[PDB]
């Protein structure tokens, strides 16, 4: 996250970090004790992925952390990296052992399609992650967050030569300086409804981070909430 | 009065009933409060809630 | 303006104040030396209106001010207070004598319909005025300004039982505390394009100012830019 | 290249020409700068400009 | 089942009720038939009806 | 009507003819015993208007006819001939004496806005009238009718340099030869729902009748059904 | 085709029949000498497919016919029978040997996305095939054709409980009796532009053929024209 | 005059040029006729054409 602020411990208790060949290569959100939702492009790899919940400083111990192995990855069935790296950018990770729910390890709420879209259209979401604090920069140690406004779809399409699909939305600032960035992908874009946060997007991609005239591109979760609930069901 | 206006005053979800009535509901881990509009935790760690002192 | 900030002198050199039976009952914007654009509901009166340009503190003298009389009022032809007080809320005031253009008395730019809408859809506009600083409060002495985000149309329609017409748009914040207010109506909603401000709205109405879950309602100027240019033409 | 992408790099207005070319233009009181993309004042008090020191 | 699909099988108007139920209704001069879906004349010359032999 | 067919007696028992300085200058539809709905441009005149219901051959007697005088005309409040001859092209005529309802004098049904639009979107309507049977031609003696398909809005806008407002819709055929025409204006565009006809449009205007690449333009009644019910209420 | 008419020889010289384990199980259209465009669900089989161009009566010889083997099938990359049998219902068949172009074996024109959609929105297309002449009926011997009107999207969605995707459009009649049917799938939906036919759809699916209140569902070719041109390129 | 109105009078395809001008074009196997609006066959069996007597 470029131009955000340090989260306070447990401020985003649904946030998880994904660790592999490299630490904090992507984020994710807790759906329930056994499942994480992330971006499919994060998990288009043969390397083993570790999930860390209750995380605050990826280089310190707060005594609130929980590490798990990923035993199965379900990319959305429409995702196809050969055709497009970011269209239908959503996947689910099954954990080996359940997370233990507490003040620091709490699921994100997920409404149905209609309400996820109503929540998105309120127009102001929070993105969080341990991604780069500047374009081409170092990762954050302390989890970062940033409030981002929703961007009009035609305005977003005019901002780039790259195709913005209807499975994506844009959010962020024109002026540059504030945006999600490499390492944040997979993490949450949430909307707070009377103190209860709901998942409204997945941090997906962009061109250069926090560049003037450019926006953050996010997976439009409303189109996938049914699939999330159907694939992550426990009982 | 109607889900089409101010979410029928439901904190989370609203469904229209017959004759300009509405039924409010909440996401998993929450229950409809006394007022039949608000949502309150029904579990120890309800989703999307910050419980650590800020 | 509730929850805004004091403008610096000449920061909004297109802003004018309208004075009548009561001072600063509405604002307006300079189209050219002889014409002001304002809200039609401001000028649905038989009382004489005075326009003041180069104004900063409505109770002090900066030596940059210019007072004019209104000799003719052109409400938009669709405006009809009997049917609806705020639909097609736009009018033009012809001044008796031309304003003298300077660093403190400068017109607002007005693009065509397509570009006014593109500018509006950038999603962040500035509103300014001497209206109330709190709902039911006192007027501002120093011109106030506030940056307001554009609001999704369906979200705005869901926020109120009152009809939001396609000649209007909504802007502002859900959380309450920041909004235009009585006395600001008629003034500008502008969008800055590479340092050049363009008129994107007219401050029109709302329910209680800066109330949580409520937005500012603005005349969608894009639908009227041709009429503005056609009626205010000098040569 | 096209008005459909980044306003054809025009600061203000863009019009598509034949064979993926564009013509940039500016509002009243402004002229197309040397670069044929930017807008510069062509009058003493161009619209929408803040000229008082901030 | 739902007004969103085949007008909830109502001949004229449909309104959604709670728990996937619907209420059918008819325009002025018509009444809801026995089947609670169809509309039948309730007046001598109901609107929009051709009664002269064709 | 160009290229239609003769109606059978009582096939369109809601149809009325308007007679003035010239016979059958427009049509109309029976709302109830005292009110006709027609096009506002038909009744932008100082000449007295006569309404004839139960009409089949405007030059013969079927013994099913009823003549009335118009005592008041209510053009829609948005109609403004000075700005545009056909935008908001709808008016109501109050009759001096009530029509006597029978198999030949029957009102047209009028649904609410939502259902009038659903009915229009079924895409096939009937237009009827005593208008010209060819462009610049003679009027019809026997009432004519024609089934017309709804036309996509962008396709209609591309067909003409004239503005097609959102208060209008287009219907008819590309190939030329079938269309409403002068003298039909004011009459009904109806949609049959399980044998019950509902008013979905008002015959309004077009360029040359039944010309290739041109369509009939109709008032979109859905936007006015509430006003019709509110102004024509008897008890 | 239910309720259509017999084509005249060479009236649809782009039409081909697909033969397999069963004759005339689907249709197709000639893109060029080596490629046919059809529906992906037609060619979700391991059985060998034969293509016949210049065909009129599938049980007679006109001396205008050309039989080819299919050497490769390219279903669109988004088609996924496991998720949905008809979404992205389009495929290409490469022929073993080129067809010889003549008055009876002629390609269908294919415009770009913008113009294919403009052509579709003209609202009247021709469908042709050797499919069933009644729901559950026998195949046609002589190629059948039927003009079908485009159906409003919301009207189509209201007609069925099955999802109508944005990759599909609906066309046909409410009243029942006229529609495409089993065996026509894969064949063309074309729009004539000044005597030149363009491909606007692929016959895809429906519930019971020609049922009242139901429509034919077609692949919206505009979304795939670029892919057709890119995959069928010869030089 | 404009592609936005009557396809700029082009039989098939239209592209807007600078200063309210348009360029008409045709699909593969066709060429722009003398009038610079109409499309005529440029090959023996142009696509989408019925050449057998009807
Ligand atoms: N928002 C961005 N610019 C961005 C986000 C994620 C990412 N992987 C790259 C760029
Ligand atoms: N934005 C507002 N709440 C508002 C604006 C102007 C006004 N006259 C009243 C209320
Ligand atoms: N549909 C038409 N071309 C038409 C309809 C009415 C009319 N007054 C003139 C032309
Ligand atoms: N249009 C139809 N009802 C239809 C079309 C093709 C098909 N395979 C089945 C049904
Ligand atoms: Ca740590
Ligand atoms: Ca002062
Ligand atoms: Ca007569
Ligand atoms: Ca044969
Ligand atoms: Cl690093
Ligand atoms: Cl900001
Ligand atoms: Cl909210
Ligand atoms: Cl006061
Ligand atoms: Cl804010
Ligand atoms: Cl901008
Ligand atoms: Cl005559
Ligand atoms: Cl026809
Ligand atoms: Cl119907
Ligand atoms: Cl059979
Ligand atoms: Cl028909
Ligand atoms: Cl056409
Ligand atoms: Na930026
Ligand atoms: Na507020
Ligand atoms: Na025509
Ligand atoms: Na049917």
JSON list of C-alpha atoms in Angstrom, two decimals, chain C residues 8-14 31 101-112 114-115 118-119 193-198 229, chain D residues 3 7-8 10-15 23 25-28 30 38-41 43-54:
[
{"chain": "C", "resi": 8, "resn": "UNK", "atom": "CA", "xyz": [-7.75, 31.93, 0.46]},
{"chain": "C", "resi": 9, "resn": "UNK", "atom": "CA", "xyz": [-8.44, 35.24, -1.41]},
{"chain": "C", "resi": 10, "resn": "UNK", "atom": "CA", "xyz": [-8.89, 34.58, -5.14]},
{"chain": "C", "resi": 11, "resn": "UNK", "atom": "CA", "xyz": [-8.92, 30.84, -4.64]},
{"chain": "C", "resi": 12, "resn": "UNK", "atom": "CA", "xyz": [-12.47, 30.73, -6.30]},
{"chain": "C", "resi": 13, "resn": "UNK", "atom": "CA", "xyz": [-12.43, 33.89, -8.42]},
{"chain": "C", "resi": 14, "resn": "UNK", "atom": "CA", "xyz": [-15.59, 32.76, -10.28]},
{"chain": "C", "resi": 31, "resn": "UNK", "atom": "CA", "xyz": [-20.01, 32.92, -16.88]},
{"chain": "C", "resi": 101, "resn": "UNK", "atom": "CA", "xyz": [-12.07, 40.73, -15.12]},
{"chain": "C", "resi": 102, "resn": "UNK", "atom": "CA", "xyz": [-9.04, 40.41, -12.82]},
{"chain": "C", "resi": 103, "resn": "UNK", "atom": "CA", "xyz": [-7.25, 37.89, -10.49]},
{"chain": "C", "resi": 104, "resn": "UNK", "atom": "CA", "xyz": [-10.27, 38.07, -8.11]},
{"chain": "C", "resi": 105, "resn": "UNK", "atom": "CA", "xyz": [-13.12, 38.25, -10.74]},
{"chain": "C", "resi": 106, "resn": "UNK", "atom": "CA", "xyz": [-12.51, 35.40, -13.25]},
{"chain": "C", "resi": 107, "resn": "UNK", "atom": "CA", "xyz": [-15.09, 33.29, -15.16]},
{"chain": "C", "resi": 108, "resn": "UNK", "atom": "CA", "xyz": [-15.53, 29.56, -14.53]},
{"chain": "C", "resi": 109, "resn": "UNK", "atom": "CA", "xyz": [-14.78, 27.42, -17.63]},
{"chain": "C", "resi": 110, "resn": "UNK", "atom": "CA", "xyz": [-17.70, 25.59, -19.17]},
{"chain": "C", "resi": 111, "resn": "UNK", "atom": "CA", "xyz": [-17.02, 22.60, -21.41]},
{"chain": "C", "resi": 112, "resn": "UNK", "atom": "CA", "xyz": [-19.56, 20.98, -23.78]},
{"chain": "C", "resi": 114, "resn": "UNK", "atom": "CA", "xyz": [-19.70, 15.39, -23.19]},
{"chain": "C", "resi": 115, "resn": "UNK", "atom": "CA", "xyz": [-16.69, 16.88, -21.37]},
{"chain": "C", "resi": 118, "resn": "UNK", "atom": "CA", "xyz": [-16.44, 13.36, -18.23]},
{"chain": "C", "resi": 119, "resn": "UNK", "atom": "CA", "xyz": [-15.23, 15.95, -15.70]},
{"chain": "C", "resi": 193, "resn": "UNK", "atom": "CA", "xyz": [-8.60, 19.69, -14.88]},
{"chain": "C", "resi": 194, "resn": "UNK", "atom": "CA", "xyz": [-4.79, 20.19, -14.84]},
{"chain": "C", "resi": 195, "resn": "UNK", "atom": "CA", "xyz": [-5.25, 23.42, -12.84]},
{"chain": "C", "resi": 196, "resn": "UNK", "atom": "CA", "xyz": [-8.21, 24.70, -14.85]},
{"chain": "C", "resi": 197, "resn": "UNK", "atom": "CA", "xyz": [-11.57, 24.54, -13.13]},
{"chain": "C", "resi": 198, "resn": "UNK", "atom": "CA", "xyz": [-14.70, 23.65, -15.04]},
{"chain": "C", "resi": 229, "resn": "UNK", "atom": "CA", "xyz": [-23.56, 29.30, -23.85]},
{"chain": "D", "resi": 3, "resn": "UNK", "atom": "CA", "xyz": [-9.45, 9.98, -27.80]},
{"chain": "D", "resi": 7, "resn": "UNK", "atom": "CA", "xyz": [-8.07, 11.67, -23.83]},
{"chain": "D", "resi": 8, "resn": "UNK", "atom": "CA", "xyz": [-5.58, 11.11, -26.68]},
{"chain": "D", "resi": 10, "resn": "UNK", "atom": "CA", "xyz": [-4.96, 16.17, -24.80]},
{"chain": "D", "resi": 11, "resn": "UNK", "atom": "CA", "xyz": [-5.02, 18.28, -21.62]},
{"chain": "D", "resi": 12, "resn": "UNK", "atom": "CA", "xyz": [-8.60, 19.42, -22.30]},
{"chain": "D", "resi": 13, "resn": "UNK", "atom": "CA", "xyz": [-10.49, 18.38, -25.45]},
{"chain": "D", "resi": 14, "resn": "UNK", "atom": "CA", "xyz": [-9.82, 15.64, -28.00]},
{"chain": "D", "resi": 15, "resn": "UNK", "atom": "CA", "xyz": [-11.29, 14.81, -31.43]},
{"chain": "D", "resi": 23, "resn": "UNK", "atom": "CA", "xyz": [-6.58, 16.80, -32.65]},
{"chain": "D", "resi": 25, "resn": "UNK", "atom": "CA", "xyz": [-8.21, 21.66, -28.39]},
{"chain": "D", "resi": 26, "resn": "UNK", "atom": "CA", "xyz": [-8.86, 23.99, -25.44]},
{"chain": "D", "resi": 27, "resn": "UNK", "atom": "CA", "xyz": [-11.71, 26.01, -23.91]},
{"chain": "D", "resi": 28, "resn": "UNK", "atom": "CA", "xyz": [-12.26, 29.77, -24.67]},
{"chain": "D", "resi": 30, "resn": "UNK", "atom": "CA", "xyz": [-6.81, 29.15, -24.04]},
{"chain": "D", "resi": 38, "resn": "UNK", "atom": "CA", "xyz": [-1.34, 21.13, -23.47]},
{"chain": "D", "resi": 39, "resn": "UNK", "atom": "CA", "xyz": [-3.46, 24.27, -23.01]},
{"chain": "D", "resi": 40, "resn": "UNK", "atom": "CA", "xyz": [-1.99, 27.65, -22.16]},
{"chain": "D", "resi": 41, "resn": "UNK", "atom": "CA", "xyz": [-3.60, 31.06, -21.44]},
{"chain": "D", "resi": 43, "resn": "UNK", "atom": "CA", "xyz": [-6.01, 36.02, -22.63]},
{"chain": "D", "resi": 44, "resn": "UNK", "atom": "CA", "xyz": [-5.17, 38.12, -19.45]},
{"chain": "D", "resi": 45, "resn": "UNK", "atom": "CA", "xyz": [-7.68, 36.34, -17.11]},
{"chain": "D", "resi": 46, "resn": "UNK", "atom": "CA", "xyz": [-8.39, 32.86, -18.59]},
{"chain": "D", "resi": 47, "resn": "UNK", "atom": "CA", "xyz": [-11.39, 31.05, -17.07]},
{"chain": "D", "resi": 48, "resn": "UNK", "atom": "CA", "xyz": [-11.03, 28.62, -14.18]},
{"chain": "D", "resi": 49, "resn": "UNK", "atom": "CA", "xyz": [-7.51, 29.71, -13.31]},
{"chain": "D", "resi": 50, "resn": "UNK", "atom": "CA", "xyz": [-6.21, 30.72, -9.94]},
{"chain": "D", "resi": 51, "resn": "UNK", "atom": "CA", "xyz": [-3.67, 33.54, -10.52]},
{"chain": "D", "resi": 52, "resn": "UNK", "atom": "CA", "xyz": [-3.55, 35.03, -6.94]},
{"chain": "D", "resi": 53, "resn": "UNK", "atom": "CA", "xyz": [-0.59, 33.58, -4.99]},
{"chain": "D", "resi": 54, "resn": "UNK", "atom": "CA", "xyz": [-1.78, 30.71, -2.75]}
]
